[PDB]
Amino acid sequence: MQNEEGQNVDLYIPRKCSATNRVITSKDHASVQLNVGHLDDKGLYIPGSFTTFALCGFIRAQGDADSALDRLWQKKKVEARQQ
């Protein structure tokens, strides 16, 4: 949200679930954030280089978080050449 002039007005921009797109609230303590590190040509982890995924409490309680994260990681690895 922005003013007519163009100034940011919101207190903060909440994160969104990487799978459901739901807004992650401040008291959604079931939500999680995961970093999947990247590997070089020799199968060595490169420090500071990872893909970040956020999962909401709704999906994690529903139990679809595992499959959703698997699909998202597969797509992101295909895009980023992580094999």
Binding site: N3, V9, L11, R15, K16
Partner: protein, 217 residues
């Protein structure tokens, strides 16, 4: 003085975390009221809303305990609610203040029509429910004021909302449920997905990962 027992408390005492929005972004639990006191304590104001006695029947009479409801707020988008039952009214009030400080939440404020100046009302229609009490908040034009009963009006004033319309259904004479429904309605402000939030999220390191080396000791 204060000896933090959590990573978040340690970071707040070490000044690595300077704003409540950093915690709100990652939704980390807050288990020490000293964090809130250090971050937004100076601008916080507390108010006792009701002292409710409750009684438990026993073999040798009725055991009476008192319930204290406390509302804390900065009037600038931060509000919290606390309920504490205790034998003594003073102890109940102290516990309620601590709980409200711990339960402070961020409140999203938007515009009714033209977006000039600071926000004055709720971004969209919201509804909170506690027990049988349902409280609905509707955006209002500038100058409309806070159209609400005394309890929701106090909660909204502490939250910092300038003008809004409200409707209520159910046993609103149940003050605890009324205030809890108002708090839920205010909390639901940031959970609604609007077009301005359609932009893809750019994640940032959580505090525990950013200051992992500092917390490693």
């Amino acid at each position: 003085k204060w000896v933090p027992v959590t990573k978040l408390g340690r970071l707040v005492k070490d000044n690595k975390i300077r704003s409540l929005e950093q915690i709100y972004l990652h939704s980390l639990p807050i288990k020490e009221f000293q964090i809130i006191d250090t971050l937004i304590g100076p601008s916080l104001k507390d108010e006792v809303m009701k002292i409710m006695p409750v009684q438990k029947q026993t073999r040798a009479g009725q055991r009476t305990r008192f319930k204290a409801f406390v509302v804390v707020g900065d009037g600038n988008g931060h509000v919290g609610l606390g309920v504490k039952c205790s034998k003594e009214v003073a102890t109940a009030i102290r516990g309620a203040i601590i709980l409200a400080k711990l339960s402070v939440i961020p409140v999203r404020r938007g515009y009714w029509g033209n977006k000039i100046g600071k926000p004055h009302t709720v971004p969209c229609k919201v509804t909170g429910k506690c027990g049988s009490v349902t409280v609905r908040m509707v955006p209002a034009p500038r100058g409309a004021g806070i159209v609400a009963a005394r309890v929701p009006k106090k909660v909204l004033q502490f939250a910092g909302i300038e003008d809004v319309f409200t409707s209520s259904r159910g046993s609103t004479k149940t003050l605890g449920n009324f205030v809890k429904a108002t708090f839920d309605c205010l909390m639901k402000t940031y959970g609604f997905l609007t077009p301005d939030f359609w932009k893809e999220t750019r994640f940032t390191k959580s505090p525990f990962q950013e200051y992992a080396d500092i917390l490693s000791k």
